[PDB]
Amino acid sequence: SVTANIENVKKVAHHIQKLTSIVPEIGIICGGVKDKITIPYTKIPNFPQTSGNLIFGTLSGRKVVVMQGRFHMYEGYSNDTVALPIRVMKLLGVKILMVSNAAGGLNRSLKLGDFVILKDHIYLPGLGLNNILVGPNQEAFGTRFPALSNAYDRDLRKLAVQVAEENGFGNLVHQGVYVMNGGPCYETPAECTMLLNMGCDVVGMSTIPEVVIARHCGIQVFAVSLVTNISVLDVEGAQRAELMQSWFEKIIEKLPKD
Amino acid sequence: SVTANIENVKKVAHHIQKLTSIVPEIGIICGSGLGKLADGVKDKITIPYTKIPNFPQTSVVGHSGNLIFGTLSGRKVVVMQGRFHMYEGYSNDTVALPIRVMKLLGVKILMVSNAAGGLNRSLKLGDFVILKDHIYLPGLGLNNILVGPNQEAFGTRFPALSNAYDRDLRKLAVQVAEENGFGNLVHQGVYVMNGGPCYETPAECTMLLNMGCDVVGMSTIPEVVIARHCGIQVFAVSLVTNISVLDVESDLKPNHEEVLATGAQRAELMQSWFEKIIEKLPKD
Amino acid sequence: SVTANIENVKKVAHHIQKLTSIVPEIGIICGSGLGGVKDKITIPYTKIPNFPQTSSGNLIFGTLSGRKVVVMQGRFHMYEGYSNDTVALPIRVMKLLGVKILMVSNAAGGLNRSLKLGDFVILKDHIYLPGLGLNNILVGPNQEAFGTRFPALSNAYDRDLRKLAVQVAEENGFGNLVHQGVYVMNGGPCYETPAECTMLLNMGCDVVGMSTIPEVVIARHCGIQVFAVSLVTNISVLDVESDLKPNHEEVLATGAQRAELMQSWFEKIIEKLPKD
Ligand SMILES: Nc1nc2c(ncn2[C@@H]2O[C@H](CO)[C@@H](O)[C@H]2O)c(=O)[nH]1
Ligand SMILES: Nc1nc2c(ncn2[C@@H]2O[C@H](CO)[C@@H](O)[C@H]2O)c(=O)[nH]1
């Protein structure tokens, strides 16, 4: 709807900056914060509309902005719509984006409730000409052809694992390749088999577009899938929510800080 | 086009119900090989798409597709004569609307045929590949027919495609084929949709075959998705209208004429098969 | 964007034919490694009504290796947001202008592990990921004046042109740089992730790029013979642990470094094309 260029994103971010003094260093999109300011999307002009909230505050002694209310491609949201919040985070000061999502577990060693830290992704829609970055490149935010090298910051993944390991739930944590199915259908057994064989570990309908935008504008990304279902290969969340929440809090606690 | 939402679909459904007393229990999407089936419907009421306000318009070189009501083996059917292929540029709503209309009309089972290239090397020209599953390549991209606000009136936001190709219908179809002595023509496999309208390159065919795809076509899955989304049971058969070329060195090439020819040649048998499956469908 | 139908294409072709009497038999789409034509007129896209606009881009007519050529300087990439019609029109204009053979280069990532930087990979086939996923440039009403509703893509990359290309490279001392392979299109504009590259490699892809296939599909649709070469402007990184990453500036540098060789090759290829 509203082109996610520097002028429009600057407008939304400037507005939000009147609504709050909190300069978030960490962006959090969830698939508890202290001294919080809850800004409903409805309150934000030219900001995408789900009802969703942008929660600012402090988490493990860090300034965070939480996105409550997500914009999925399968809902029909445009590239710009989905990009805009992430680029706003950029202008607001977000240096690190932490994302959780629900995913089907393709990898046969995954179990319900497992955490699969994304170490890489296969952006099926992206490969198929539905990349969120298709269209004029917004040069203010990033380069025309972003590399997705170390897209899922290895250091953040290392830290997340350590945090999980140190807190006794290291057994739950895997790292894997997330493949995006544009959705909104769940994957057929044939699709899951194909996806597994493509070297995919978990499959979901979200996240990648945000990650691409985040990486495009230089926001480090941390992303974890919660395996909320085990993919069926042949045709013949609430639980782990507070664990994952605790995990995100603890990781943030140990995030480096300027 | 017009949104395949409940209001518009009701309008269309109601328009249709003014034009026929036939409450279809079975919807049939005339793909390759079914042209003759359409013609065999007893006591037809033929409703050109052009006579249905807000119904999607499609033509065969100028001639409007038709909705065909009547019976087939003693069962009330609506035959879609004229499908809306995504490669023609039809919208998700256009493709979805007729299936959702079928839902409101009383369709419980959707039978669809299509023409497909045989990726699976054991397939022969003229084989019937009952779809037991599919790989919705456009769907995996961001071109799933359900992309956009979900029409809650018709189904859930995230439909599972578990048993999309009803195993019981598949079993029945196989049994009917077996009983009638053409079981040997009958296979089951995975259909992968290539948005098209280009036939697959050999590299694409090799890739698709390695993905576990048995047949490849440009249709059907979106209809199936819409069908499943609204709880219509689906039976789908691919007619192997060509053997996919996996080798770039080959001089053989897919051409629609031969596809039509295989459809024409197998149409009688497929009609018979469908008619006989229909007669054995459970209940009434 | 104007529909790439016969009427609109004709109009464009005609306005162009006002600006030049060079009837091109060879269309060249410059990608990496291209960018010599003699007796040339440079027609900026800006001077051509309804012709797509890109940065201006030029339609260059003239003589190359004795043959009438039209060189498309300024390409239309799907990742830029260009429509099918926009990408198709110029190829269809070429067709009307008289083009028989389309020679196209591009920059691509080297997936095939035997590939080296600056290698040439003649496309012998492709995987049109956007095309499989309903983003085929031909989606929409078929333009019957140009081609059939369901084009086959067999011999899409003319085996004879490929043979000639390889022979020309061989005898001109650089056959060692020349491979043939499968090109996969990534809609882009992101470079592939390591997981994507690994998947693409495993799909049987040798090189990956964000271009070419749409034009090739349109060229084949209207019966233009196609020769296409990927310059391996970067070795795809399959390892997520690796520090190595693609870099457009390096991609550009590699292309330019090979441009002269690519030019020579294309020229010597055009040199050996059958003259009727
Ligand atoms: N993709 C693909 N579609 C086919 C093939 N054979 C028949 N078809 C179908 O039949 C028409 C083209 O012949 C299209 O509508 C396709 O859905 C094939 O080999 N590959
Ligand atoms: N998809 C893809 N395109 C590349 C690669 N290297 C060079 N290119 C091409 O060069 C430009 C970006 O470098 C795009 O237009 C691509 O088509 C690569 O590794 N992957």
Task: Return all residues near C268 (Cβ < 8 A) that are at least 6 apart.
Answer: C65, C168, C172
d(CA B138, CA B78): 28
d(CA A62, CA B187): 60
Q: Which two tokens stand for residue C10?
A: 């004709």
- Which chains would you list as touching C if contact means 3+ CB atom pairs under 8 Å? A, B
d(CA C143, CA C145): 6
Q: In a 3-state reduction of DSSP, which class is residue C182? A: strand
d(CA C226, CA C162): 9
Q: How many domains does chain C have?
A: 1
C246 Cα nearest atom in ligand 2: 19
d(CA B108, CA C31): 54
* B60: nearest Cα among B38, B40, B77: B38
Is C175 part of the contact surface with chain A (CB cutoff 8 Å)? no
* B1: nearest Cα among B77, B84, B92: B92
d(CA B2, CA C106): 41
Q: Which two tokens stand for residue B260?
A: 């039509």
Helices C159-171 and C248-272, interaxial angle, to 10°?
A: 100
d(CA C184, CA B206): 13
Is C203 part of the contact surface with chain B (CB cutoff 8 Å)? yes
Experimental method: X-ray
Task: Return all residues near A235 (Cβ < 8 A) that are at least 6 apart.
Answer: A188, A189, A190, B132, B133, B162, B163, B165, B167
User: Three-state SS across chain A?
Assistant: CCCCCHHHHHHHHHHHHHHCCCCCCEEEECCCCEEEEEEEHHHCCCCCCCCCEEEEEEECCEEEEEEECCCCHHHCCCHHHHHHHHHHHHHHCCCEEEEEEEEEECCCCCCCCCEEEEEEEEEHHHHHHHCCCCCCCCCCCCCCCCCCCCCECHHHHHHHHHHHHHCCCCCCEEEEEEEECCCCCCCCHHHHHHHHHCCCCEEECCCHHHHHHHHHCCCEEEEEEEEEEECCCCCCCHHHHHHHHHHHHHHHHHCCCC
Element (H, E) at B13: helix B6-19
d(CA A54, CA A68): 6
Which residues of B are known binding-site members for adenosine?
199-200, 218, 242, 256
* C23: nearest Cα among C90, C100, C104, C102: C100
Resolution in A: 2.0
Domain of residue C39: give its range: 1-276
Q: Smallest CA–CA separation between A43 and chain B, in Å?
A: 22
Is B247 part of the contact surface with chain C (CB cutoff 8 Å)? no
> Under an 8 A CB cutoff, do B255 and C152 touch?
yes
d(CA C45, CA B138): 34
Is A255 part of the contact surface with chain C (CB cutoff 8 Å)? no
d(CA A65, CA A45): 18
The answer to whether residue B218 is catalytic is: yes
Task: Return all residues near B18 (Cβ < 8 A) that are at least 6 apart.
Answer: none
> Under an 8 A CB cutoff, do C149 and B197 touch?
yes
Q: Which two tokens stand for residue C193?
A: 């992730």
Ligand nearest to the CA of B208: 1
Cis peptide before B159 (omega within 30 of 0): no
DSSP C239: -
Q: In a 3-state reduction of DSSP, which class is residue C164? A: helix
**C81's torsion region: left (phi>0), alpha (psi -120 to 50) or beta?**
left
Inter-CA distances, B218 with A109, B64, B82, C204, C220, Å? 35, 21, 15, 22, 19
Contacts of B213 in chain A (CB under 8 A): 190, 194
**Which of B143, B190, B225 is the closest to A190 by Cβ?**
B190
- Which chains would you list as touching A if contact means 3+ CB atom pairs under 8 Å? B, C
The count of C-alpha atoms lying within 13 angstroms of the C-alpha of A204, restricted to the half-sphere facing its C-beta, is 25
The answer to whether residue B204 is catalytic is: no
Helices C84-97 and C6-19, interaxial angle, to 10°?
A: 50
- Residue pair A172/A115 in contact (Cβ under 8 Å)? The answer is yes
- Residue pair B8/B54 in contact (Cβ under 8 Å)? The answer is yes
**Gap from CA of C234 to ligand 2 centroid (Å):** 8
Task: Return all residues near B226 (Cβ < 8 A) that are at least 6 apart.
Answer: B4, B95, B96, B99, B100, B145, B146, B154
DSSP C157: B
Q: In a 3-state reduction of DSSP, which class is residue B248? A: coil
Catalytic one of B13, B86, B115, B116: B115
Q: What is chain A's Cα-based Rg?
A: 17
DSSP C51: S
d(CA C41, CA C70): 10
Contacts of C188 in chain A (CB under 8 A): 131, 133-134, 145
C212 Cα nearest atom in ligand 2: 17
Q: Which residues line ligand 1 (CB under 6 A)?
A: B 85, 114-117, 194, 196, 199-200, 216-219, 241-242, 244, 254, 256, 259; C 150
d(CA A116, CA A121): 12
d(CA C245, CA B123): 43
Return the number of other C-beta atoms located less than 10 Å from residue B1's C-beta.
17
Catalytic one of B256, B261, B264, B268: B256
Q: Smallest CA–CA separation between B89 and chain C, in Å?
A: 4
Is A143 part of the contact surface with chain C (CB cutoff 8 Å)? yes
**Gap from CA of B197 to ligand 1 centroid (Å):** 8
Enumerate long-range contacts of B151-154, CB under 8 Å, 24 or more apart. B151/B3, B151/B4, B151/B5, B151/B6, B151/B96, B151/B100, B153/B5, B153/B6, B153/B9, B154/B4, B154/B6, B154/B9, B154/B100, B154/B103, B154/B226, B154/B229, B154/B230
Is C276 part of the contact surface with chain A (CB cutoff 8 Å)? no
Closest Cα to atom 6 of ligand 1 = B116
Task: Return all residues near B137 (Cβ < 8 A) that are at least 6 apart.
Answer: A128, B192, B193, B194, B195, C132, C133, C134
d(CA A39, CA A51): 11
Contacts of C126 in chain B (CB under 8 A): 201, 203-204
Q: Smallest CA–CA separation between B12 and chain C, in Å?
A: 25
Is C195 part of the contact surface with chain A (CB cutoff 8 Å)? yes
Q: Which two tokens stand for residue C4?
A: 């790439």
What are the phi and psi torsion angles at B238 (to 5°)? -95, 130
The count of C-alpha atoms lying within 13 angstroms of the C-alpha of C161, restricted to the half-sphere facing its C-beta, is 23
Spell out where C46-201 has E strands: 58-64, 67-73, 101-110, 120-127, 178-185
In the numeric block, the tokens 């029409």 are attached to B151
> Under an 8 A CB cutoff, do A145 and C242 touch?
no
CATH number at residue C252: 3.40.50.1580
Closest Cα to atom 14 of ligand 2 = C210
> Under an 8 A CB cutoff, do A126 and C187 touch?
yes
Q: Which two tokens stand for residue B43?
A: 């006591």
DSSP B88: G
- By CB atoms closer than 10 A (0-12, 13-18, 19+), residue C100 is middle
Q: Which of B136, B199, B204, B223 to mutate to test the pocket of ligand 1 (most atoms within 8 A of CB)?
A: B199
